[PDB]
Amino acid sequence: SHHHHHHGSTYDFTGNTPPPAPQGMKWVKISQLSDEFNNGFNTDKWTKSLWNYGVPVQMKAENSGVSDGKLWIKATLGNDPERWFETSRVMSKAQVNYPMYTVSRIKGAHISAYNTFWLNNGNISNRNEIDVIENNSNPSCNCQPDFPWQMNSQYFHVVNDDTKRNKGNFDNRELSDANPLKGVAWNEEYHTFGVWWKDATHIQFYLDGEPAGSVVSARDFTRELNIIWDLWTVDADWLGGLAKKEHLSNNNINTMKIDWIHTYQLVEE
Ligand SMILES: [Mg+2]
């Protein structure tokens, strides 16, 4: 045959297409939440947000930037015994509401840390949040055998310290046979990770163009959310274990790279 394998799927394995538009609707680009990262760090769109997670995280503005067509976040070694994991966080200045779709092309740092892509508005006691990835391809804990291919996705709906949470994980070994990223670990190549936030409760994740996990919020979302990427570690087996300090001097594994983000609003045609 003269055809290509990708012609046999309605999915775009490159991640460059949103989900099918429902009848009477269309996808339009939100330019303030989209970037190819070819024109530096655009401060009209993005900000370095430096609140810390727990020890050993130290968020720093110099641990993120835009270079060689990518947004990057690098983990380096500090000399405070309790804040030695120097890292960074980039978040949108604009906020977004349903119905919307966002997808980002990411190659993770190969250290024991969550490489993240998430949407949030709020704090520990009151928030609406969608985690598209919390992906760790190099767990140190000897306890996460599927982590190199496991897409960790979930939501949180928190009202006055009452948490509703559910996971909708997916595994990249469950992608379709024609998808060339099937079984490719998170550090080996860039993957695309998306979310169709359909309405106040329905959240559908996407991986390399294919429907991944999904969740239904137990309560309506009511907030508009910022888009965030960060890289963090902690001494917890659910994260995959604490990052090895020796890996932070290796520039081939210590850097999370984001090639692009495409964000779309679904609107009336
Ligand atoms: Mg790029």
Swiss-Prot record:
Residues 11-269 form the GH16 domain. Its main location: secreted. The keyword DNA-binding does not apply. Keywords: Glycosidase, Hydrolase, Secreted, Signal. It comes from the Bacteria. GO terms for cellular component: extracellular region. The active site is at E129 (nucleophile), E134 (proton donor). Substrate binds at residues 51, 60-70, 74-76, 129, 134, 165. Its EC number is 3.2.1.81. GO terms for biological process: carbohydrate metabolic process. It is found in: Secreted. One of its GO terms (molecular function) is beta-agarase activity. It catalyses: Hydrolysis of (1->4)-beta-D-galactosidic linkages in agarose, giving the tetramer as the predominant product. Cleaves the beta-1,4-linkages between beta-D-galactose and alpha-L-3,6-anhydro-galactose residues in agarose. Cleaves agarose in a random manner with retention of the anomeric-bond configuration, producing beta-anomers that give rise progressively to alpha-anomers when mutarotation takes place. Belongs to the glycosyl hydrolase 16 family. This is Beta-agarase C. It comes from Zobellia galactanivorans (strain DSM 12802 / CCUG 47099 / CIP 106680 / NCIMB 13871 / Dsij). The lineage of its organism: Bacteria, Pseudomonadati, Bacteroidota, Flavobacteriia, Flavobacteriales. The gene is agaC. The chain holds residues 69 to 328 of 328 of the full protein.
